[PDB]
Structure formats: C-alpha cells, structure tokens
C-alpha cells in the first residue's frame, strides 16, 4: 500500500494483521465505521484505497451527494466497513507522493458515430457501488490528470463495442486540485 | 327534522337500494359479454330497464331537498348528482328529435363506404379504410381514401350536425348553462375553501397555458418528422411548410405512431421484446396476472380476491362461446371485481394485464365510499393511474428482475432514443390534435364561429395550431370534424389532454419518493411502499373531494403542470434540437395545391356600372363551368385528347367578400393529378373571348394574374 504512485478515485487500488500497527504510518484526520466498531476490527480482509484530500473528507461520508460517489467510487457497506482519512510522507516508505489530485466531475453517454455523434448530458454514467467506473470514463480521468489543465473535457472510447460492433463513446469532465497538506500524501482508505 | 337530516335519510335509503339494483344490471351485462346470444341480450335489456326506472324515480324525489339548506358537503354533492335534469328540460317533440338525430349520425358513420375511383367494384368499410391508412406508403392511394371519407360521409353529417348543435344548446340553457360547451366543462368544476375551488372558465385558461408550454417540444418533433417524410414522398412536402393531412399515419392524423418505421432514429438497433423469452419459459395467462399481482403487493396494495381468480375471464373460451375480447376491468358491486381479457403470451398483453389490474386496484380503494361517490376524482384519473403502472412494469430494470431479460444485458443509448421517439409519436404528437379539436367545438357551441365559417376556421386552426394542411380546399358543404368517431357520437374529447398531463405529474411525484436517480423514463416504483402509500391516500378518496385536493395528496400541487412531461422527454428534446438546428417551425402559406393555382380578380362595377350584378354562388358555378369548357377545348385541339372536365373538377379557394379567388384544375379520374398551371393558362387564353362574353367582362375587369 506504500509503493509506487498513489491511485486516483477513478482507478482506485484493490487488494485482498495488526490494525494498530498499520495506523502508525499516517496521521488520522477523521475516522468513522458502519455496522462495526474499530475494537472489533482489531479483536478475508479487503482494502480499497485512493488519493484524496483531507480538506474534502466530508465527501467520503455516507449520505454524501458529492461527485466522488457519483462518478468515481462508492462503497456498498454490505459487510462491516471502516473509513480512514489520513496523510503521510510515502517517499520514506518506498513510495511516492502525488503532486495534485484528480477526480471525475461528470461523465455521460453519446449516440451516433462521427461526424454525426451527439453527446447528451441527460444520459449520465454513474459508478455502481463496489465497482470501478467504465473504461471510457476512466480514460478521461487519466488524460485529465496528465493534461496540466484544471478543467479537462474530452470524448473518448476504450475498447467498448455495442451489439452491432460499433464503438461506444462517452464524454466527461475531470477536475484537478492542489494538495491541502504541504509535502504529504493525502489518502482515503475503505477497509472491510 | 331539518332539511339536511331528511336529505340524510333519503340518501342512505337510496344508496342501499342502488347497490342492489346496480349489481343485478352488472351481472346481466357480464353474462352477455362472455356468452353472446339472444337469451342473454334479453336479460341484459330487462335488467337495465329496471335500473333506469329506479334511478329516475329517486332523481325526481331528490328535487325536494334544496341545496341552499345543506351545509354538509358530502350530502350536497350527492344531491347535486341526482338533481340533474338533462334532456328532460326539452319538450317531447324536441327530446324525441334529438334522440333520432344522434342515432342517425352514429349509423351513418359506422356504415359508411368509400369506393376506389378507378375500380367501382372495390369498396371498403371504415375498418378496411383504416387498415390501409395505417400501412400504405402510396401518396395517391392515401389521398383518394382521405378525400373519399370526407366527401362520402362528412357531407351526410353536415346538416345533422347543424341541427344537433341547436338542440344541445337549448338543452344546456334549460339546465342553466350558457351553452353545451359550458355544460361539458362542468365536469371539472369544484367548490370549496382555500384554493380548492375551480370554475368552468378556468379550464379554458389552463389548457391554453399548458398548450403553450408543450408547443416548443412539438415543434422539434414536427420538424424532425417533416424532414423524414420529405424522403418518403419526394417533391411533395415543402421544407418550411405544414404537413399534408393524408400522410400522418391514420385517417385523421390523431396519432403519429405509424410513422415510426420512417422516423426511427437508429434503424440498426431494436427495442426490447421479451415475447420469445416468455414462450421459452412456458408462461401462460395465469402466470402473467399472478406477476401483476406481485407487483402491486410489493408496494403495499391489495391482493385480488378469491372470487376474482374464479369469476374472471383471462383467456378466450374454447367451448364455442362467442365473446368480445376487448380488455376491460369490471366492478360489479358487492365486493365483486373481475377482468375480461383474451390474454396471449406476449409482451403487449403482459403490460396490458398491469394496466387493467391498476383499474381494479382503484375500484377497490374507494369501495368504502357512498355509491354515488364511487368514481375517480375526474374523468382522467382512472386512465392516468393505469398508465403509470404500465410505464414502471415496462422498464429494463423490471424485466431483468423478472428473469425475462438477460441479467448482463448491456445499456444502449441509441436504443433509449428510439424508445423516447416512439413514445413521443403517441403522447406528444397527439396533444395539439386534442387541444385544437375541443377549442373548435367550444367556439361552435358558444357561437364564436358562425355556420358560414365552420370549415374556414377548422382548417385555419389546423394550420396555425397543429401544422397540418389540407390536400384539397373544402367549402361549407363539408363537415370534417364529424368524420371522427367522438364527434359523431357526442363524446367529450378534452379528457385525453388532461389525462396525459396528470399521468406525468403522478409518475414524477412517485419517483421522487422512491429516490429514483437518473432519467425519469427509467423509473421503477416496485418495492417502494412509501410511493405506494402516497398513491393509496389519493385513490381511496373516490370523488368525495375536489380533484384539486386529490391531486395535492399525490403531486403536492393544486394545479396541472406540464413540466413533468417536458422532463420525461428532456433527453429526446436535446437530441432533436441539435439535429434540427434552425429548420424548426412552419409557415401557413404553403399548400400542396398553391404552387399551380391562378388568382382571379373581378370588378363588376367598373364593367357594367348600373347594369352590374352580384357575384353570388350561381356566378361562381358558371365560372367553374366556363373553365371546364376551356380545358376541354384546349386538350382536344392541342393534345388531341378527349377529357370530360366538369365544373366539379375545378377547385376554388381563398374566396373573399370582394370578387377575388384562386382556382386549379384536376383530372376527372385522378385527384392527385393537378393540371400544370401553364396548360391551364394556355386554355384560358384560347377561350378567353368566350369567358369574357359569358360575364359581359373585358380584359381589364376580368383579370387572370399571370396572363
Ligand atoms: C498534475 O501532476 C501531473 C504529474 O503527475 C502533471 O502532469 C504533467 O503535465 C505536463 C503538462 O503541463 C506534461 O508535459 C507535456 O508532456 C507532453 C507529452 O510528453 C508534451 O507533448 C508537452 O510538450 C509537455 O512536455 C508532463 O509530461 C505531465 N507529467 C506526466 C508524468 O505525464 C499535471 O500537469 C498536473 N496537473 C496540474 C493541473 O497541474
Ligand atoms: C423486490 O424485492 C424482492 C425481495 O428483495 C426481490 O426478490 C428477489 O429477487 C432476486 C433476484 O432479482 C433474488 O436473488 C437471486 O434469486 C435467483 C433465483 O431466482 C438466484 O438464482 C440468485 O442466486 C439470487 O439468489 C432474491 O432472492 C429475491 N428475494 C426474495 C424472493 O426475497 C425482487 O426482485 C424485487 N423486485 C424489483 C422490481 O426490484
Ligand atoms: C430517500 O432519501 C432520503 C434522504 O437521503 C439522503 O439524501 C438522498 C438524496 C441521498 O443522497 C441519500 O443517499 C442521502 O442519505 C431519506 O431520508 C433519510 O431517512 C433516514 C431514515 O431511514 C433518516 O434517518 C434521515 O435523517 C433522512 N434524511 C433526511 C435528509 O431526511 C429517505 O428515507 C429515503 N427514502 C427511502 C425510501 O429510503
Ligand atoms: C328540474 O326540472 C324541474 C321541473 O321539471 C319537472 O320535474 C323534473 C324532475 C322532470 O320530471 C320534468 O319532466 C318535470 O317537468 C324543476 O322543478 C321546478 O323548479 C321551479 C324553480 O325553478 C319551481 O318553480 C317549480 O315549481 C318546480 N316544479 C316542480 C314540479 O317541482 C327543478 O327545479 C329542476 N332542477 C334543476 C336542478 O334544474
Ligand atoms: C413496421 O415494420 C415492422 C417490421 O420491423 C412491420 O412488422 C412486420 O409486419 C409484417 C406484415 O404484417 C409481419 O409479417 C412481420 O412479422 C412483422 N414483423 C414484426 C417484427 O412485427 C410493421 O408492420 C411495420 N409497420 C408499418 C406501419 O409499416
Ligand atoms: C376560486 O375562487 C376565487 C374567488 O373567491 C377566485 O378568485 C377570483 O378570480 C377572478 C378571475 O381571475 C378574479 O377576477 C377575481 O378578482 C378573484 N377574486 C378574488 C377574491 O381573488 C379564484 O380564481 C377561483 N379559483 C379557480 C381555480 O377558479
Ligand atoms: C394519378 O396521378 C399521379 C400523379 O400525381 C400518378 O402518379 C404517378 O405514379 C407512378 C407510379 O405508378 C410514378 O412512377 C409516377 O412518377 C407518379 N407521377 C408523379 C407526378 O408523381 C398516378 O399514377 C395516377 N394514378 C392513376 C392513374 O391511377
Ligand atoms: C485547457 O485549458 C483551457 C483554459 O486555459 C481550456 O479552454 C481548454 O478547453 C482546456 N482543454 C481541455 C481539453 O479541456
Ligand atoms: C356529513 O355527513 C356524514 C354522514 O352522511 C358524516 O359522516 C360527516 O361527518 C358529515 N360531515 C360534516 C362536515 O358534517
Ligand atoms: C396477500 O395474500 C397473502 C396470501 O393469502 C396474505 O397472507 C397477505 O396478507 C396478503 N397481503 C395483504 C397486504 O393483505
Ligand atoms: C367458481 O364459480 C362457480 C360458479 O358459481 C362455482 O360453482 C365454483 O365452485 C367456483 N369455484 C371456486 C374455486 O370458487
Ligand atoms: Zn384503461
């Protein structure tokens, strides 16, 4: 969990212990659980994680209507789960710290092929709880992150074909934000 | 006792007996419909006679309880229902005459035939003509059918409709209404405190307001359809004009459903059809109704009674009995509910089963009300409730849960557009039709449109409101509105307008409660007991409360609102808008026959002075005869052809009080064949001298524009 670049909300990591020991690498800003108490966690284990901002921790909470849980990542809470939002310097642990944070703010379908392709905001593409965003939505976030553009808009296709063999197009917007904590990696973890 | 107390006892006794008598009538009618023969027909007629005699006696008795002395709104409302006089305000001669006219108009409509103008032995009844209009893509065939019906039937009803209007207005006045239009609008009238009152005049303001809100959507659909029809019928349709009346998918242009095969957005994609799966999984009529029952149970509504499952007719009899399969929901009284349907294992009957059971659910909900109040809040409430249940059941979401659609079945945005377009053709494309038709009838009954301008205003309104233009000019011997079932048979029509608007208000309100996210057309209220409760609270009221109250209980509003409809079709609107660009809208100047018409202006005063005559109908007849003559001479001498042109082959339009009109000529044996303007102008010059003498006019007082 401490190696390589930190995954973004639209490409979150998935990996399937001493609970206290793990909570000694990060400074915790917020902590909450659902259908469980942290004492029981300590006394399969699945960890999902991604880069996020601690300033925006209010969006990680259940009941949120924020973009994060609409287009990027949403928990199912089918099983006992705890939410951790914390920060650390990953470089000293064999990893690397992010320079900015990127999330999808919109994604929606398009009908027809070029030059007659028409994109409709009325057909939103939401992420299913417990699942990753569509390959064509994920593509937008990736290009957005690496574009050097605070607001990035694009129409892409990513090996998604329909029933007649035609490309499936999707349009969306990615937003890039600055770090809130100086010289630290800000991460969100969902542990179930 | 006081008047109110006496009225109380009167109604209690009436309602008890009314239930008993109504039940016997309902049973006799049922037996006939599920077993058609002479014995059952006789029993049915006898049972109805007894009911009518009962009701009439108590109606007269109800006149002894003045409404001014009643403070209890439940009692007052029931007395108002019983105290209606109706036709009884007329004298015996007028009452008998009106009944005769209504019977006559119905008979003429149902037995009308149109014969192929080029094959006298090939005649079709209305059912045959409708079957052709729904499928034919032949411009000519569609035209002689359209015109034939209007000429063969419409011209028989004209004089009957004129007498009909006069008699119905006298009746309405006898019942203290301004006119018969005012009489019909009383069906939406309510009284009460707060904002729960609704005057008859308010209905007019609301339909006009709603129409204007809808219009921007209709214009986008209209432009789209026009662009497609221009390919189906090359050089027949103008890109900036109205659509020809005979090319709209049916005999009247009421629905645009049958244009789908020409207008479908994405022709490589198909709509969802689970018929094959139902057959593969061995579904039958019983299973279909059992699944409909589960749907309603999931939202906290009733199961069907033990009797329902035994007494109902869910499939067509195989025992020789003759029945009428047309699907209906019955409430026979005394907690006896039934459905009469001939169910097939198809997706269409699957959805129909949900529709019909929705009616039963509503009937059960208000079964606790007094007999006279066991109805919907308005005439459009029952249908609106049924339709929303069909919308929910038809979603891909619901079909997957039922196992009728593959769980991994992918989403396709092009398919969703095809779906919305098909829906718009039936739901949106009909609203301007309903609006325009009622507006015309209201003005006719009121007296805003005089007899001399009935057809003039009919077609003027069609071009301005709907965007449809007649293939041929019609004078005042025609009665086009009477060629429609509902007009000929004395039915109100506005119910279809209001039903549609309410339907979407109910659907949106229920989807918000169910916490639906995303497009409204993908909403499914299954397993939502909160949505179910909100609905049940409205359904059980029957008609004991103002419909504005009943509406508030579900949609949390006292007014009809077009926004829910516009929201439903929002994704379609955006797609059409981008595609249509700036080609949206139409003029009312162009018509199929205008390009080759000749304008004639005559001045009789400057020609003859004191000897000048009046340009009456007889002079117009002579003119048409003179033109036909000129056409015969031209063709015989120039083309060496003998063509029997008659005055009837000369069409005249846009006639003013002053002597100014336009005309064109068609072939005697072809109505889609308009003689080229250049050939007509040549004929006029050749015989110009004879035309001149006929009217004692020179070449300055008889002007043919273009010559
Ligand atoms: C957020 O941080 C990322 C780094 O993780 C920044 O990505 C970098 O953006 C610059 C453009 O501003 C990229 O340089 C360009 O590369 C292309 C392709 O080689 C070249 O054609 C251009 O001329 C230019 O050199 C840079 O390569 C990219 N870094 C990586 C690893 O891809 C991103 O800009 C930051 N976002 C914001 C809003 O600051
Ligand atoms: C309304 O709510 C009920 C209850 O939750 C839903 O019924 C359920 O349907 C699901 C499948 O849609 C059932 O799960 C699956 O059942 C199949 C057998 O048909 C099995 O092979 C799978 O492994 C899986 O177990 C679920 O058990 C069932 N729940 C019951 C019957 O209590 C219903 O589908 C919902 N309807 C709508 C429109 O949402
Ligand atoms: C429908 O949703 C409301 C509100 O839920 C929140 O807002 C939604 C739009 C969505 O973003 C949800 O994920 C949010 O959680 C529910 O109202 C809540 O009900 C619970 C009881 O179960 C109550 O404790 C909360 O206080 C309510 N919240 C508010 C703002 O009133 C409502 O129950 C949902 N309806 C159904 C049938 O589940
Ligand atoms: C309904 O009409 C009656 C008069 O018509 C008679 O009674 C009907 C029930 C029916 O049987 C007709 O064929 C009969 O000719 C109205 O009763 C009269 O009302 C006026 C007041 O406007 C009063 O002066 C008369 O004396 C009443 N006559 C009788 C016999 O009662 C009755 O008021 C009308 N009701 C409504 C709602 O219009
Ligand atoms: C629209 O096209 C469909 C085909 O996609 C027509 O439906 C077919 O009609 C023929 C003749 O009755 C039947 O033999 C086929 O089995 C039908 N096919 C299907 C899938 O139903 C439909 O009739 C056309 N409608 C109009 C108005 O032309
Ligand atoms: C309900 O009744 C009130 C009267 O109490 C109606 O209000 C009148 O409406 C007319 C037409 O707009 C106005 O000219 C009057 O000045 C209004 N009077 C008052 C006191 O406001 C109201 O319109 C009725 N509601 C409906 C739907 O008919
Ligand atoms: C009546 O006149 C029309 C012309 O308005 C004839 O239409 C033609 O139909 C044939 C098909 O058999 C087409 O190839 C021609 O191009 C059409 N003409 C035009 C101008 O479109 C129609 O055939 C005539 N009907 C008869 C004689 O029964
Ligand atoms: C890049 O940023 C500019 C503003 O500086 C914006 O106009 C442009 O649309 C952005 N590019 C993309 C693909 O969004
Ligand atoms: C009206 O009368 C009914 C009985 O017929 C009674 O149940 C109801 O409460 C009364 N309502 C009012 C306002 O008096
Ligand atoms: C539906 O029918 C079942 C079986 O008879 C019954 O137990 C259940 O209570 C009924 N539903 C309701 C709401 O009464
Ligand atoms: C169905 O109705 C018939 C006619 O009344 C009756 O004889 C029969 O027993 C009923 N069957 C059931 C299950 O109620
Ligand atoms: Zn119905």
Enumerate the residues of chain B whose CB falls inside 8 A of the CB of residue A111.
265-266, 413-414, 417, 575
Chain centre distance of CA B564: 22
Chains A–B, number of C-beta pairs less than 8 Å apart: 37
Is B486 catalytic? The answer is: yes
What letter would DSSP give residue B635? I
Are A65 and A114 contained in the same domain?
no
Residue with tokens 């004009």: B241
Enumerate the residues of chain B whose CB falls inside 8 A of the CB of residue A170.
none
Residues 6+ apart with CB under 8 A from B374: B331, B363, B366, B367, B542, B543
Residues 6+ apart with CB under 8 A from A172: A71, A104, A105, A106, A107, A108, A125, A137, A140, A153, A154
Neighbour-count burial for B128-157, b at 16+ CB within 10 Å, e otherwise = ebbeebeeeeebeebbbbbbbbbbebbebb
In terms of C-beta distances under 8 Å and separation of at least 24 residues, what long-range contacts does B269-274 make, across chains too?
B269/A163, B269/A164, B269/B412, B269/B414, B269/B415, B269/B418, B270/B415, B271/B415, B271/B418, B271/B419, B271/B422, B272/B396, B272/B399, B272/B405, B272/B415, B273/B347, B274/B347, B274/B350, B274/B399, B274/B404, B274/B405
Phi, psi at residue B688, to the nearest 5°? -60, -40
- Segment holding B666, helix H or strand E: strand B660-667
Between the alpha carbon of residue A79 and those of residues A33, A36, A45, B189, B452, the distances in Å are 11, 9, 11, 56, 79
3-state SS track over B283-294: CCHHHHHHHHHH
Q: Report yes or no on A118 lying in a domain.
A: yes
DSSP B329-374: EEE-STT-EEEE----SSHHHHHHHHHHHHHHHHHHHTTTS-GGG-
Interface mutation target, options B396, B413, B416, B581, chain A, most CBs of A under 10 Å:
B413
Residues 6+ apart with CB under 8 A from B216: none
- Rounded to a whole number of angstroms, the distance from the CA of B410 to the nearest CA of chain A is 8
Q: Dihedral angle at the C-alpha atoms of B223, B227, B230, B235, nearest 10 degrees?
A: 80
The active-site residue, picked from B356, B383, B470, B508, is B356
Rounded to whole angstroms, the Cα distance separating B283 from B403 reads 12
Are A168 and A185 contained in the same domain?
no
Rounded to whole angstroms, the Cα distance separating B416 from B405 reads 16
Helix (H, G, I), strand (E, B) or coil at B446: helix
Q: Dihedral angle at the C-alpha atoms of B169, B173, B179, B182, nearest 10 degrees?
A: -130
- Ligand 3 centroid–CA B399 distance in Å is 27
Q: Which residues constitute the domain of residue A163?
A: 101-177
What letter would DSSP give residue B465? I
Are A74 and A39 contained in the same domain?
yes
Q: What share of chain B is helix, strand, coil (3-state, %, to 5)?
A: 60, 5, 35
Cα angle B315-B321-B324, degrees, rounded to a multiple of 5: 60
- Ligand 11 centroid–CA B317 distance in Å is 17
- Ligand 6 centroid–CA B172 distance in Å is 24
Rounded to whole angstroms, the Cα distance separating B653 from B691 reads 20
Are A139 and A183 contained in the same domain?
no
Tell me, in Å, the resolution of the deposited structure.
Answer: 2.4
Are A143 and A158 contained in the same domain?
yes
Query: Is the minimum distance from the CB of B261 to ligand 5 under 6 angstroms?
Result: yes
Beta strand B468-469 with B243-244 is parallel
3-state SS track over B88-147: HHCCHHHHHHHHHHHHHHHHHHHCCEEECCCCCCCEEEHHHHHHHHCCCCCHHHHHHHHH
- Ligand 8 centroid–CA B663 distance in Å is 62
Q: Report yes or no on A13 lying in a domain.
A: yes
Are A92 and A117 contained in the same domain?
no
Residue A191, Cβ neighbours under 10 Å: how many? 19
* Structural contact between residues A88 and A187, judged by C-beta atoms closer than 8 angstroms: yes
Q: Domain count for chain A, please give it.
A: 2
* Structural contact between residues A106 and A71, judged by C-beta atoms closer than 8 angstroms: yes
Q: Which residue, by CA, sits nearest to atom 14 of ligand 10?
A: B302
Rounded to whole angstroms, the Cα distance separating B247 from B253 reads 8
- Ligand 9 centroid–CA B13 distance in Å is 16
Residue with tokens 């989403």: B411
Rounded to whole angstroms, the Cα distance separating A12 from B9 reads 75
Enumerate the residues of chain B whose CB falls inside 8 A of the CB of residue A118.
575, 578-579
Residue B251, Cβ neighbours under 10 Å: how many? 22
Inter-chain touch B570–A122, beta carbons under 8 Å: yes
Q: Which residue of A has its CA nearest to B411?
A: A162
Residue B216, Cβ neighbours under 10 Å: how many? 12
> Residue B3: exposed, middle, or buried by beta-carbon count in 10 A (0-12, 13-18, 19+)?
middle
Which of the ligands is closest to the CA of residue A154?
8
Q: Which two tokens stand for residue B192?
A: 């009460």
In 3D, which of B458, B416, B459 has the Cα closest to residue B441?
B458
- Segment holding A108, helix H or strand E: strand A101-111
Are A14 and A85 contained in the same domain?
yes
Phi, psi at residue A151, to the nearest 5°? -125, 115
Rounded to whole angstroms, the Cα distance separating B335 from A3 reads 72
> Residue B205: exposed, middle, or buried by beta-carbon count in 10 A (0-12, 13-18, 19+)?
exposed
The region, left, alpha or beta by phi > 0 then psi within -120 to 50, assigned to residue B189 is: beta
Ligand 1 site residues, Cβ closer than 6 angstroms? A 99-100, 146, 148, 150, 176
What letter would DSSP give residue B68? G
In 3D, which of B207, B170, B254 has the Cα closest to residue B439?
B207
Q: Which atom of ligand 10 is nearest to the CA of B301?
A: 13
Rounded to whole angstroms, the Cα distance separating B476 from B459 reads 11
Phi, psi at residue B149, to the nearest 5°? -60, -45
Enumerate the residues of chain B whose CB falls inside 8 A of the CB of residue A123.
413, 416, 519, 571
Residue with tokens 């109606």: B59
Q: Does B409 touch chain A (CB under 8 A)?
A: no
Q: Report yes or no on A3 lying in a domain.
A: no
Angle, in degrees to the nearest 10, between helices B38-61 and B3-33: 170
Cis-peptide, bond into residue A115, ω within 30° of zero: yes
The CA R_g of chain A, rounded to the nearest whole Å, is: 18
Residue with tokens 């209980």: B553
Residue with tokens 């109908």: B617
Q: Report yes or no on A2 lying in a domain.
A: no
Between the alpha carbon of residue B320 and those of residues A141, B316, B327, B456, B648, the distances in Å are 68, 10, 19, 53, 53
Helix (H, G, I), strand (E, B) or coil at B270: coil
Q: Which residue of B has its CA nearest to A163?
A: B269
Which of the ligands is closest to the CA of residue B305?
10
Query: What CATH code is carried by the domain that includes residue A75?
Result: 3.30.70.1840
In 3D, which of B557, B510, B556, B560 has the Cα closest to residue B535?
B510
Interface mutation target, options A69, A106, A111, A121, chain B, most CBs of B under 10 Å:
A111
Rounded to whole angstroms, the Cα distance separating A28 from A83 reads 11
Residue A17, Cβ neighbours under 10 Å: how many? 9
């Amino acid at each position: 969990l401490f190696r390589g670049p930190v995954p973004q909300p639209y490409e979150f990591g998935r990996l399937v212990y001493n609970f206290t020991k793990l909570l000694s690498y990060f400074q915790v800003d917020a902590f909450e659980c659902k259908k469980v108490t942290p004492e029981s966690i300590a006394t399969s284990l699945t960890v999902d994680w991604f880069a996020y901002r601690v300033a925006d921790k209010s969006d990680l909470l259940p009941g949120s209507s924020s973009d994060l849980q609409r287009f990027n990542y949403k928990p199912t809470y089918a099983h006992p789960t705890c939410l951790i939002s914390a920060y650390t310097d990953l470089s000293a642990l064999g990893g690397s710290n992010p320079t900015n944070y990127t999330l999808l703010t919109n994604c929606y379908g398009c009908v027809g092929q070029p030059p007659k392709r028409t994109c409709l905001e009325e057909f939103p593409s939401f992420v299913e709880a417990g699942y990753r965003p569509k390959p064509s939505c994920a593509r937008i976030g990736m290009q957005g992150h690496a574009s050097g553009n605070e607001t990035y808009t694009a129409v892409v296709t990513n090996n998604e074909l329909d029933s007649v063999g035609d490309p499936i197009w999707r349009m969306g917007v990615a937003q890039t934000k600055e770090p809130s904590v100086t010289d630290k990696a800000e991460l969100a973890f969902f542990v179930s | 006792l006081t008047t109110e107390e006496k009225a109380r006892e009167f109604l209690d006794k009436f309602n008890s007996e009314a239930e008993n008598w109504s039940h016997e009538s309902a049973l006799a009618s049922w037996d006939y419909n599920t077993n058609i023969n002479d014995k059952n027909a006789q029993k049915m007629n006898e049972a109805d006679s007894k009911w009518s005699a009962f009701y009439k006696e108590h109606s007269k008795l109800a006149q002894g309880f003045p409404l001014q002395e009643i403070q209890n709104s439940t009692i007052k409302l029931q007395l108002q229902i019983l105290q209606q006089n109706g036709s009884s305000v007329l004298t015996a001669e007028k009452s008998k005459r009106l009944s005769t006219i209504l019977t006559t108009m119905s008979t003429i409509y149902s037995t009308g035939k149109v014969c192929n103008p080029n094959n006298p032995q090939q005649c079709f009844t209305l059912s045959g003509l409708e079957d052709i209009m729904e499928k034919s893509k032949d411009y000519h065939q569609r035209l002689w059918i359209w015109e034939g019906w209007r000429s063969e039937v419409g011209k028989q009803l004209r004089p009957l409709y004129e007498e009909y209007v006069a008699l119905k207005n006298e009746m309405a006045r006898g019942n203290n209404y301004k006119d018969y239009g005012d009489y019909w609008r009383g069906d939406y009238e309510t009284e009460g405190g707060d904002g729960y009152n609704y005057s008859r005049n308010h209905l007019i303001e609301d339909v006009d307001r709603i129409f204007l809100e809808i219009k921007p959507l209709y214009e986008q659909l209209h432009a789209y359809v026009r662009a497609k029809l221009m390919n189906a019928y090359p050089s027949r349709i103008s890109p900036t004009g109205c659509l020809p009346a005979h090319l709209l998918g049916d005999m009247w242009g009421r629905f645009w459903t049958n244009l789908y095969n020409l207008t479908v957005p994405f022709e490589k994609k198909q709509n969802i059809d689970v018929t094959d799966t139902m057959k593969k999984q061995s579904w039958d009529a019983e299973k279909i109704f059992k699944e409909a029952e589960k749907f309603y149970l999931s939202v906290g509504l009733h199961n069907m009674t033990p009797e329902f499952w035994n007494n109902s007719m869910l499939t067509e009899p195989s025992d020789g009995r003759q029945v009428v399969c047309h699907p209906t929901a019955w409430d026979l009284g005394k907690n006896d509910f039934r459905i009469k349907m001939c169910t097939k294992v198809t997706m269409d009957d699957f959805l129909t089963a949900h529709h019909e059971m929705g009616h039963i659910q509503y009937d059960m909900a208000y079964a606790k009300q007094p007999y006279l109040l066991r109805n919907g809040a308005n005439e459009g409430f029952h249908e609106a409730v049924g339709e929303i249940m069909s919308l929910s059941a038809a979603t891909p979401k619901h079909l997957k849960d039922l196992g009728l659609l593959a769980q991994n079945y992918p989403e396709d945005y092009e398919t969703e557009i095809n779906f919305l377009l098909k829906q718009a053709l039936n739901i949106v494309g009909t609203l301007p039709f309903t609006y325009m038709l009622e507006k015309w009838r209201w003005m006719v009954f009121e007296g805003k449109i005089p007899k001399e301008q009935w057809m003039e205003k009919w077609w003027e309104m069609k071009r301005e409101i709907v965007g449809v233009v007649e293939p041929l000019p019609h004078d005042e011997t025609y009665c086009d509105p009477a060629s429609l079932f509902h007009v000929a048979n004395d039915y109100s029509f506005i119910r279809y307008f209001t039903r549609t608007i309410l339907e979407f208000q109910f659907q949106e309100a229920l989807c918000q409660i169910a916490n639906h996210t995303g497009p409204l057309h993908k909403c499914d209220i299954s397993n939502s007991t909160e949505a179910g409760k909100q609905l049940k609270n409205m359904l059980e009221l029957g008609k004991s409360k103002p419909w504005t109250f009943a509406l508030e209980q579900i949609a949390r509003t006292k007014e009809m609102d077009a926004k829910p409809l516009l929201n439903y079709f929002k994704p379609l609107f955006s797609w059409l808008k981008e595609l249509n660009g700036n080609s949206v809208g139409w003029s009312a100047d162009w018509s199929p026959y205008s390009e080759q018409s000749i304008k004639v202006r005559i001045s009789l005063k400057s020609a003859l002075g004191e000897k000048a005559y009046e340009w009456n109908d007889n002079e117009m007849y002579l003119f048409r005869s003179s033109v036909a003559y000129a056409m015969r001479v031209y063709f015989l001498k120039v083309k060496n052809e003998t063509i029997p042109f008659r005055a009837e082959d000369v069409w005249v339009s846009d006639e003013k009080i002053r002597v100014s009109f336009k005309f064109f000529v068609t072939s005697p044996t072809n109505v889609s064949d308009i003689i080229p303007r250049s050939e007509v102008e040549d004929a006029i010059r050749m015989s110009r001298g004879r035309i001149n003498d006929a009217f004692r006019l020179d070449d300055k007082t008889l002007e043919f524009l273009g010559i």
